[PDB]
Design an enzyme around this catalytic site. Structure first.
Site, PDB file in Angstrom:
ATOM      1  N   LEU A  19       0.941  -3.181 -14.340  1.00  0.00           N
ATOM      2  CA  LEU A  19      -0.265  -2.654 -13.733  1.00  0.00           C
ATOM      3  C   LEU A  19       0.053  -1.501 -12.809  1.00  0.00           C
ATOM      4  O   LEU A  19      -0.819  -0.668 -12.551  1.00  0.00           O
ATOM      5  CB  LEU A  19      -1.056  -3.751 -13.020  1.00  0.00           C
ATOM      6  CG  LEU A  19      -1.477  -4.905 -13.921  1.00  0.00           C
ATOM      7  CD1 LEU A  19      -2.324  -5.891 -13.198  1.00  0.00           C
ATOM      8  CD2 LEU A  19      -2.244  -4.323 -15.064  1.00  0.00           C
ATOM      9  N   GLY A  20       1.282  -1.422 -12.336  1.00  0.00           N
ATOM     10  CA  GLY A  20       1.715  -0.297 -11.546  1.00  0.00           C
ATOM     11  C   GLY A  20       2.795  -0.629 -10.559  1.00  0.00           C
ATOM     12  O   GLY A  20       2.689  -1.567  -9.771  1.00  0.00           O
ATOM     13  N   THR A  22       5.011   0.357  -7.311  1.00  0.00           N
ATOM     14  CA  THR A  22       5.024   1.085  -6.062  1.00  0.00           C
ATOM     15  C   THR A  22       6.162   0.476  -5.281  1.00  0.00           C
ATOM     16  O   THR A  22       6.543  -0.667  -5.520  1.00  0.00           O
ATOM     17  CB  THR A  22       3.693   0.999  -5.289  1.00  0.00           C
ATOM     18  OG1 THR A  22       3.408  -0.354  -4.932  1.00  0.00           O
ATOM     19  CG2 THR A  22       2.547   1.540  -6.117  1.00  0.00           C
ATOM     20  N   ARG A  23       6.701   1.226  -4.330  1.00  0.00           N
ATOM     21  CA  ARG A  23       7.789   0.669  -3.542  1.00  0.00           C
ATOM     22  C   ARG A  23       7.401  -0.616  -2.812  1.00  0.00           C
ATOM     23  O   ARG A  23       8.291  -1.388  -2.451  1.00  0.00           O
ATOM     24  CB  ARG A  23       8.333   1.734  -2.591  1.00  0.00           C
ATOM     25  CG  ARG A  23       7.431   2.135  -1.470  1.00  0.00           C
ATOM     26  CD  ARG A  23       8.210   2.951  -0.456  1.00  0.00           C
ATOM     27  NE  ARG A  23       7.368   3.935   0.212  1.00  0.00           N
ATOM     28  CZ  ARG A  23       7.399   5.234  -0.043  1.00  0.00           C
ATOM     29  NH1 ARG A  23       8.076   5.718  -1.072  1.00  0.00           N
ATOM     30  NH2 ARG A  23       6.681   6.060   0.711  1.00  0.00           N
ATOM     31  N   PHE A  24       6.107  -0.876  -2.598  1.00  0.00           N
ATOM     32  CA  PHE A  24       5.696  -2.116  -1.941  1.00  0.00           C
ATOM     33  C   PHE A  24       5.693  -3.317  -2.878  1.00  0.00           C
ATOM     34  O   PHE A  24       6.429  -4.278  -2.661  1.00  0.00           O
ATOM     35  CB  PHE A  24       4.330  -1.945  -1.266  1.00  0.00           C
ATOM     36  CG  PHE A  24       3.863  -3.177  -0.545  1.00  0.00           C
ATOM     37  CD1 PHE A  24       4.768  -4.024   0.066  1.00  0.00           C
ATOM     38  CD2 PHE A  24       2.522  -3.464  -0.445  1.00  0.00           C
ATOM     39  CE1 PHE A  24       4.347  -5.156   0.705  1.00  0.00           C
ATOM     40  CE2 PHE A  24       2.100  -4.579   0.211  1.00  0.00           C
ATOM     41  CZ  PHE A  24       3.013  -5.424   0.792  1.00  0.00           C
ATOM     42  N   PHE A  25       4.898  -3.281  -3.928  1.00  0.00           N
ATOM     43  CA  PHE A  25       4.960  -4.290  -4.967  1.00  0.00           C
ATOM     44  C   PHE A  25       5.031  -3.613  -6.308  1.00  0.00           C
ATOM     45  O   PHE A  25       4.528  -2.506  -6.501  1.00  0.00           O
ATOM     46  CB  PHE A  25       3.726  -5.230  -5.103  1.00  0.00           C
ATOM     47  CG  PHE A  25       3.494  -6.184  -3.977  1.00  0.00           C
ATOM     48  CD1 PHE A  25       4.300  -7.275  -3.803  1.00  0.00           C
ATOM     49  CD2 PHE A  25       2.362  -6.079  -3.205  1.00  0.00           C
ATOM     50  CE1 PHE A  25       4.059  -8.167  -2.805  1.00  0.00           C
ATOM     51  CE2 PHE A  25       2.104  -6.980  -2.225  1.00  0.00           C
ATOM     52  CZ  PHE A  25       2.959  -8.020  -2.013  1.00  0.00           C
ATOM     53  N   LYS A  26       5.648  -4.311  -7.237  1.00  0.00           N
ATOM     54  CA  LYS A  26       5.618  -3.938  -8.628  1.00  0.00           C
ATOM     55  C   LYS A  26       4.650  -4.944  -9.206  1.00  0.00           C
ATOM     56  O   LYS A  26       4.832  -6.149  -9.027  1.00  0.00           O
ATOM     57  CB  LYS A  26       6.995  -4.047  -9.275  1.00  0.00           C
ATOM     58  CG  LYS A  26       8.136  -3.650  -8.376  1.00  0.00           C
ATOM     59  CD  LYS A  26       8.116  -2.203  -8.033  1.00  0.00           C
ATOM     60  CE  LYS A  26       8.853  -1.974  -6.744  1.00  0.00           C
ATOM     61  NZ  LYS A  26       9.459  -0.619  -6.703  1.00  0.00           N
ATOM     62  N   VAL A  27       3.634  -4.472  -9.904  1.00  0.00           N
ATOM     63  CA  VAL A  27       2.597  -5.359 -10.395  1.00  0.00           C
ATOM     64  C   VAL A  27       2.660  -5.367 -11.903  1.00  0.00           C
ATOM     65  O   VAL A  27       2.760  -4.314 -12.536  1.00  0.00           O
ATOM     66  CB  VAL A  27       1.217  -4.921  -9.878  1.00  0.00           C
ATOM     67  CG1 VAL A  27       0.169  -5.832 -10.347  1.00  0.00           C
ATOM     68  CG2 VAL A  27       1.232  -4.892  -8.381  1.00  0.00           C
ATOM     69  N   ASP A 135      -7.567  -4.746   3.351  1.00  0.00           N
ATOM     70  CA  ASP A 135      -7.915  -3.474   2.716  1.00  0.00           C
ATOM     71  C   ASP A 135      -8.786  -3.754   1.491  1.00  0.00           C
ATOM     72  O   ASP A 135      -8.290  -4.001   0.395  1.00  0.00           O
ATOM     73  CB  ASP A 135      -6.670  -2.654   2.396  1.00  0.00           C
ATOM     74  CG  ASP A 135      -5.883  -3.169   1.234  1.00  0.00           C
ATOM     75  OD1 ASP A 135      -5.820  -4.393   1.021  1.00  0.00           O
ATOM     76  OD2 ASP A 135      -5.292  -2.336   0.533  1.00  0.00           O
TER      77      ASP A 135
HETATM   78  N1  LIG Z   1      -8.735  -4.991 -14.675  1.00  0.00           N
HETATM   79  C1  LIG Z   1      -7.880  -5.374 -13.760  1.00  0.00           C
HETATM   80  N2  LIG Z   1      -7.080  -4.455 -13.162  1.00  0.00           N
HETATM   81  C2  LIG Z   1      -6.206  -4.830 -12.223  1.00  0.00           C
HETATM   82  C3  LIG Z   1      -6.098  -6.134 -11.851  1.00  0.00           C
HETATM   83  N3  LIG Z   1      -5.137  -6.192 -10.911  1.00  0.00           N
HETATM   84  C4  LIG Z   1      -4.659  -4.972 -10.674  1.00  0.00           C
HETATM   85  N4  LIG Z   1      -5.282  -4.125 -11.531  1.00  0.00           N
HETATM   86  C5  LIG Z   1      -5.208  -2.668 -11.621  1.00  0.00           C
HETATM   87  O1  LIG Z   1      -3.895  -2.193 -11.455  1.00  0.00           O
HETATM   88  C6  LIG Z   1      -3.871  -1.447 -10.267  1.00  0.00           C
HETATM   89  C7  LIG Z   1      -2.541  -1.739  -9.599  1.00  0.00           C
HETATM   90  O2  LIG Z   1      -2.588  -3.007  -8.991  1.00  0.00           O
HETATM   91  P1  LIG Z   1      -2.700  -3.246  -7.428  1.00  0.00           P
HETATM   92  O3  LIG Z   1      -1.336  -3.327  -6.827  1.00  0.00           O
HETATM   93  O4  LIG Z   1      -3.497  -4.467  -7.117  1.00  0.00           O
HETATM   94  O5  LIG Z   1      -3.459  -1.923  -7.012  1.00  0.00           O
HETATM   95  P2  LIG Z   1      -4.263  -1.873  -5.653  1.00  0.00           P
HETATM   96  O6  LIG Z   1      -5.623  -2.492  -5.748  1.00  0.00           O
HETATM   97  O7  LIG Z   1      -4.257  -0.456  -5.205  1.00  0.00           O
HETATM   98  O8  LIG Z   1      -3.282  -2.831  -4.856  1.00  0.00           O
HETATM   99  P3  LIG Z   1      -3.199  -2.983  -3.288  1.00  0.00           P
HETATM  100  O9  LIG Z   1      -2.885  -1.709  -2.599  1.00  0.00           O
HETATM  101  O10 LIG Z   1      -2.231  -4.052  -2.924  1.00  0.00           O
HETATM  102  O11 LIG Z   1      -4.522  -3.490  -2.880  1.00  0.00           O
HETATM  103  C8  LIG Z   1      -5.102  -1.804  -9.480  1.00  0.00           C
HETATM  104  O12 LIG Z   1      -5.575  -0.698  -8.772  1.00  0.00           O
HETATM  105  C9  LIG Z   1      -6.085  -2.113 -10.525  1.00  0.00           C
HETATM  106  O13 LIG Z   1      -6.670  -0.903 -10.916  1.00  0.00           O
HETATM  107  C10 LIG Z   1      -6.913  -7.074 -12.456  1.00  0.00           C
HETATM  108  O14 LIG Z   1      -6.854  -8.252 -12.167  1.00  0.00           O
HETATM  109  N5  LIG Z   1      -7.804  -6.680 -13.401  1.00  0.00           N
HETATM  110  C1  LIG Z   2       6.641 -16.356  -0.340  1.00  0.00           C
HETATM  111  C2  LIG Z   2       5.664 -15.362   0.253  1.00  0.00           C
HETATM  112  C3  LIG Z   2       5.751 -14.007  -0.406  1.00  0.00           C
HETATM  113  C4  LIG Z   2       5.000 -12.941   0.373  1.00  0.00           C
HETATM  114  C5  LIG Z   2       4.944 -11.610  -0.358  1.00  0.00           C
HETATM  115  C6  LIG Z   2       4.576 -10.449   0.542  1.00  0.00           C
HETATM  116  C7  LIG Z   2       5.651 -10.058   1.536  1.00  0.00           C
HETATM  117  C8  LIG Z   2       5.427  -8.661   2.083  1.00  0.00           C
HETATM  118  C9  LIG Z   2       6.477  -8.250   3.095  1.00  0.00           C
HETATM  119  C10 LIG Z   2       6.305  -6.846   3.652  1.00  0.00           C
HETATM  120  C11 LIG Z   2       7.583  -6.354   4.307  1.00  0.00           C
HETATM  121  C12 LIG Z   2       7.516  -4.929   4.813  1.00  0.00           C
HETATM  122  C13 LIG Z   2       8.894  -4.344   5.066  1.00  0.00           C
HETATM  123  C14 LIG Z   2       8.911  -2.885   5.554  1.00  0.00           C
HETATM  124  O1  LIG Z   2       8.093  -2.580   6.442  1.00  0.00           O
HETATM  125  O2  LIG Z   2       9.761  -2.134   5.037  1.00  0.00           O
END
Ligand SMILES: Nc1nc2c(ncn2[C@@H]2O[C@H](COP(=O)(O)OP(=O)(O)OP(=O)(O)O)[C@@H](O)[C@H]2O)c(=O)[nH]1
Ligand SMILES: CCCCCCCCCCCCCC(=O)O
Ligand SMILES: [Mg+2]
Lengths: 319, 267
Positions: A19-20, A22-27, A135
């Site tokens: 799904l995308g 990013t340095r924060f999460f890989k989705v 957010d």
């Molecule tokens: N259709 C659909 N798209 C999703 C879903 N989850 C994530 N995506 C898409 O993939 C993108 C990347 O995932 P996210 O990390 O959740 O993106 P985001 O909403 O900007 O994430 P955050 O910044 O953490 O809120 C999102 O913007 C959505 O467009 C989902 O459950 N359904």
């Molecule tokens: C088991 C619980 C998992 C929780 C997953 C989210 C953790 C997010 C941590 C954010 C850390 C930020 C570090 C930084 O500022 O570089």
């Protein structure tokens, strides 16, 4: 490590899509016994950081939002699933509002109204439960293919307060779409607090703006920092909102000083009838809730529930 | 001594052949000849009622489901009648067993000449095609005919074909051998049923259209046609988990048909 690489170690969840990154999460999208699921994988580069603080929070968001029909908390969390990665699990929804705005069939005015109504219902549900979504964005508002809104990705691990001086904190946690859009309430900018219900109302108001501008963001980071200082007001984008009453709701909600931002329930009280059809309060929210959450109604049984209730439905909606 | 008790059947959705209905005989008298009505309507003397003891009646068979006709009516071929109405004709209906829903009926109307270019209904009768537990009707059936009306195909029908009603069934069961035979007792009892029948003949002007349904045979077996739908054995793999996926979406991984309609019209 690629997003998929993490799933090689997991049996229960088979990689499906990304799904995308990013340095924060890989989705990633994953297939599961239950359906498709979004796995937000956090590469835990520094093991010194205590994730136990985030795991507790998410387990209390999961409990509080259990009955919140328009909120979708992270249903699972696993500190060591791949030893150098944590993972947040939630269902995958048909659309996210940012994409839905562009997918066909295009949302009618009454469907946008129904989405904005349910965004305010979701915020009100979480806020009553004791939860803030730090957010709200159109990416995080999720839409089932029957236009049930699920608010998702509750930002409990993101900072409530950001410095205005260093955009590095915004760039990391917020704006993972890399659209530079900024719905972070202006008082969240300074120079580990608690998140406030008015900090969601600015976020929600801006999402209803973008919904009704067909995806024009109401602010980006510089425009929000100008609005924070009073040197900008998004009058041009607000004039792209075609409905006067949703325009005023948004202009109310995005209000600069948080004290002037009501509760979601107040906006839903004020907006009864005028922005949000009376039928949304009396029929469609309670009727459509039978399809909504931990519900068990099959596609075959959904059609039979709606066929058996057609006469009742026609009376309420039409007369 | 006797062949075994095995019950053989075919699913209706597996028997891809036309339904056939035999139109047997029309027993009973017609509505006499009310000469009061003829003085009022002189065209009525030029009608089958008044021209022959047995006018050359015809039957139309039409299959209805949910109050709608499944296909066109089928008419019996012309047969000249003199002293009894006995078509004895198998009608191939335009509907097949797979085409028939559980509430399929056959609306049978007996028609008569009423002057040039005008048929009047002598009567109508409707019988469901499946029984009480969804088995296609078998063998010879005598249907109550409703005078001066067309068979009603609506659900529920106002012209159902199904004392003498009960006895006739017992009599058919006796003739088929399902009732135990007791000669001394059958001899005495059937004379009473005859008396009942004759009393009903005089008491009422009832007509019966005897019809027959075909028998499905293979290797000297008898198969009943039971109503089924293809995939009727597909007991859905329903499971009660909601660990992650709290909100199931039926359209989840499905082609967006409103975008494909648009693609097909723009591109
Ligand atoms: N259709 C659909 N798209 C999703 C879903 N989850 C994530 N995506 C898409 O993939 C993108 C990347 O995932 P996210 O990390 O959740 O993106 P985001 O909403 O900007 O994430 P955050 O910044 O953490 O809120 C999102 O913007 C959505 O467009 C989902 O459950 N359904
Ligand atoms: C088991 C619980 C998992 C929780 C997953 C989210 C953790 C997010 C941590 C954010 C850390 C930020 C570090 C930084 O500022 O570089
Ligand atoms: Mg997200």
């Amino acid at each position: 490590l690629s997003v998929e690489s993490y799933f090689s170690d997991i049996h229960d969840f088979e990689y499906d899509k990304s799904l995308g990154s990013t340095r924060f999460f890989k989705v990633a999208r994953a297939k599961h016994r239950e359906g498709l699921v979004v796995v937000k994988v956090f590469a835990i580069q520094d093991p010194t950081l205590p994730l136990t603080s985030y795991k507790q929070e998410l387990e209390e968001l999961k409990i509080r939002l259990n009955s919140a029909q328009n909120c979708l908390p992270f249903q699972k969390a696993s500190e060591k699933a791949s030893e150098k990665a944590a993972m947040l699990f939630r269902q995958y929804v048909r659309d996210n509002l940012y994409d839905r705005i562009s997918t066909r069939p295009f949302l009618n005015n009454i469907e946008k109204r129904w989405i904005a109504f349910q965004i305010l219902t979701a915020v009100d549900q979480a806020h009553k439960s004791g939860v803030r979504h730090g957010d709200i964005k159109t990416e995080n508002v999720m839409v089932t293919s029957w236009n049930w809104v699920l608010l998702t990705d509750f930002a409990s691990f993101k900072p409530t307060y950001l410095p205005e001086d260093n955009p590095a904190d915004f760039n990391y946690f917020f704006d993972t779409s890399r659209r530079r859009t900024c719905y972070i309430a202006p008082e969240r900018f300074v120079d580990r607090g608690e998140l406030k219900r008015a900090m969601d109302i600015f976020s929600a108001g801006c999402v209803i703006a973008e919904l009704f501008t067909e995806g024009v963001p109401l602010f980006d980071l510089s425009q929000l920092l100008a609005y924070r200082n009073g040197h900008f007001f998004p009058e041009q984008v607000l004039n792209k909102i075609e409905d006067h009453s949703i325009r005023e709701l948004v202009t109310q909600m995005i209000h600069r000083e948080p004290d002037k931002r009501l509760e979601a329930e107040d906006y839903l009280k004020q907006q009864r009838g005028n922005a949000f059809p009376e039928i949304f309060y009396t029929f469609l929210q309670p009727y459509m809730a039978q399809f909504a959450k931990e519900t068990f109604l099959s596609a075959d049984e959904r059609i039979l529930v709606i066929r058996k209730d057609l006469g009742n439905i026609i009376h309420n909606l039409c007369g | 001594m006797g062949e075994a008790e095995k019950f053989h059947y075919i699913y209706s959705c597996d028997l891809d052949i036309n339904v056939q209905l035999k139109i047997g005989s029309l027993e009973g008298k017609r509505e006499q000849k009310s000469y009061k009505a003829v003085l009022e309507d002189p065209m009525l003397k030029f009608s089958g009622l008044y021209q022959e003891t047995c006018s050359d009646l015809y039957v139309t068979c039409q299959v209805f489901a949910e109050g709608k006709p499944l296909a066109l009516p089928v008419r019996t071929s012309y047969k000249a009648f003199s002293t009894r109405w006995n078509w004895n004709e198998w009608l191939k209906l335009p509907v097949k067993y797979p085409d028939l829903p559980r509430n399929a009926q056959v609306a049978l109307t007996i028609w008569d000449v009423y002057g040039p270019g005008k048929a009047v209904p002598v009567g109508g009768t409707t019988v469901s095609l499946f029984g009480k537990y969804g088995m296609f009707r078998q063998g010879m059936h005598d249907l109550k005919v409703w005078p001066n009306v067309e068979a009603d195909g609506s659900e529920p029908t106002k012209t159902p074909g199904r004392q003498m009603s009960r006895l006739a069934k017992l009599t058919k069961a006796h003739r088929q051998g399902h009732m135990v035979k007791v000669d001394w007792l059958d001899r005495l009892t059937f004379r009473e049923i005859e008396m009942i029948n004759e009393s009903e003949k005089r008491s009422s002007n009832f007509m019966y259209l005897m019809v027959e349904f075909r028998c499905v045979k293979c290797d000297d077996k008898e198969y009943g046609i039971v109503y089924y739908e293809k995939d009727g054995d597909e007991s859905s793999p329903i499971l009660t988990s909601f660990e992650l996926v709290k909100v199931p979406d039926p359209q989840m991984s499905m082609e967006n048909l409103v975008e494909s309609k648009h693609h097909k019209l723009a591109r």
